[PDB]
Structure formats: C-alpha cells, structure tokens
Amino acid sequence: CAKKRNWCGKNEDCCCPMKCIYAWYNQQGSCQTTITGLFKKC
Numbered sequence: 001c002a003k004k005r006n007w008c009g010k011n012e013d014c015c016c017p018m019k020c021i022y023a024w025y026n027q028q029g030s031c032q033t034t035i036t037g038l039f040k041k042c
Contacts (some may be wrong), residue, residue, distance in 0.1 A: 001014065001015035001016075002014050002015060002018075002030060002031045003015060004018060004030070004031050004032055004033060005020060005031075006029055007021075007025075007028055007030040008020040008029060008030070008031045009028045009029050010029055011012070011029075014031040015031075015032060015038070016037065016040060016042030017037040017038060017039070017040040017041070017042050018031040018033050018034075018037040018039070019031075019032065019034060019035045019036050019037050020024055020032070020033055021034065021035075021037065
C-alpha cells in the first residue's frame, strides 16, 4: 500500500488500484493508477 509519487518498482506493494509504471531506463517503476489501476477493484 503505497501512493502515487513514491514508486513501487514493481506492482507488488501499492495501495490499489495502482500498478507500478515505467518510462525507458527500467529497473524501477512508479505507483500509477493505470493499465489496471481503475478496474482492478480492490
């Protein structure tokens, strides 16, 4: 359970419905309400 701003790296520790996000560099990610951070009813 994390909030958008501090990332998760991967979609393992977020406070849904957020998935971790990416840009280009990779390795890490961001908690963002997308891809499934909307209809991933939690």
